[PDB]
């Protein structure tokens, strides 16, 4: 897997 | 980490508002090197977004998404503030102010600046504060604890005001407290601005319950003293256990709620002194109200938080006339803080 606004969870 | 790099008086005549200038730190930005305030001429040098991995969501405001994260390079907790679509001018202003104030007393530390290589969504990376939500924390504070944390916020405001910056959004949600460590940080510099004497500012700042009367009557030539009204609204909510203290239904009702407590005599004196044009929407709703004694908000559950010194200090923050309010440094000298000062 997941990325959110480029950040990996 | 990521950083920015370089590349009163006459007034308008017989009508219009009387001009005002800050009583303190008036001309501090005029004499700075232009690089201190000229954030449009700077460019961001970005850090590595891959250093940070998300742990949990903290903030879902209208204008940011905030996550707790870990820096995988050094294993430290950070917070990431993902900026929702907003002026480029606005993000570089928040960055510039955070960099100018970095290392000052009780000012949150900006650690890095990164962006998504795909969407180009920028994010600010901060030191993490292990906050207790104010809706749980404030009702557990002792009398001393309120004095201590109010003094900590005043250190941050005297510092930022001395550096030429108005915060313009002082409220509980922008004050992080790690209560185990008595550690307080003033966060959220995204509405903060550089003070220039004579400048007319946007009154659509702060958050309704913490807005000073100058914002509510559309007096644009305001200054650092706006923050002092906001701090007085926080103090009242803490010592009277009434959150928020002035609970308006909208910006017009907000001023009515204030006037039902501080009375209309001093409000109409303020409007007259600065020749403020009061929005005709106030005709039906404001009316005329007596001033209430601060003593009427005291009851069995909050009396241990109230002292003569608390009520005198509150009275000297919650003044309509922005020029009449204590400055942050004058507030720090108030008898309410005499025990906090000796403890340092
Ligand atoms: N450094 C931090 N440590 C812990 N929580 C934080 C930190 N920075 C922000 N937060 C949380 O995220 C929320 C929003 O951050 P803030 O900078 O105030 O954004 P906005 O300008 O969108 O209000 C805060 O009210 C707080 O709950
Ligand atoms: Mg905020
Ligand atoms: Mg903000
Ligand atoms: Na004290």
Residue numbers in the entry:
A (entry chain D): 95 to 103
B (entry chain A): -28 to -22, -5 to 331
Sentences from the paper on this structure:
pmcCK2 is a ubiquitous and constitutively active protein kinase. It has a heterotetrameric quaternary structure, consisting of two catalytic subunits (α or α′) and two regulatory subunits (β).2 The α/α′ subunits carry out the phosphorylation of target proteins and peptide substrates, whereas the β subunits confer stability to the enzyme, control substrate specificity, and govern cellular localisation of the holoenzyme complex. CK2 acts as an anti-apoptotic protein and is seen to be overexpressed in a wide variety of cancerous tumours. One such alternative method is via the inhibition of the protein–protein interaction (PPI) between the α and β subunits of CK2; the PPI interface is not as well conserved among other kinases as the ATP active site hence its inhibition is considered a more selective approach.
Additionally, we considered keeping the Trp residue and stapling with Cys and homoCys (hC) residues using the linear sequences CRLYGKW (P7) and (hC)RLYGKW (P8) respectively with mild oxidative cyclisation conditions. Compared to P+, P8C9 showed a greater than 5 times increase in activity in our preliminary assay (ESI†), indicating that P8C9 can efficiently engage CK2α despite its reduced size. A comparison of the LEs (calculated as outlined in eqn (S1), ESI†) of the novel peptides with that of P+ indicates that P8C9 uses its structural features to target CK2α the most effectively with a LE of 0.101 vs. 0.057 for P+. Combination of the X-ray structures and IC50 values suggest that the homocysteine-cyclised peptide, P8C9, retains the binding conformation of the peptide more effectively than the cysteine-cyclised peptide, likely due to the flexibility provided by the extra carbon atom on the amino acid side chain (ESI†). The binding of P8C9 to CK2α was further assessed using ITC (ESI†) and its Kd was found to be 750 nM. X-ray crystallography was used to confirm the binding mode of P8C9. Comparison of the co-crystal structures of P8C9 and P+ in complex with CK2α indicates that the central binding sequence of the two peptides share the same binding conformation. The crystal structure of P8C9 suggests that functionalisation of the peptide may be possible through the N-terminus or the Lys residue as both are solvent exposed. P8C9 was found to exhibit similarly high potency to CAM7117 in enzymatic assays, as well as retaining the same binding conformation and displaying an increased stability compared to CAM7117. P8C9 is the smallest peptide CK2 binder to date displaying high serum stability.
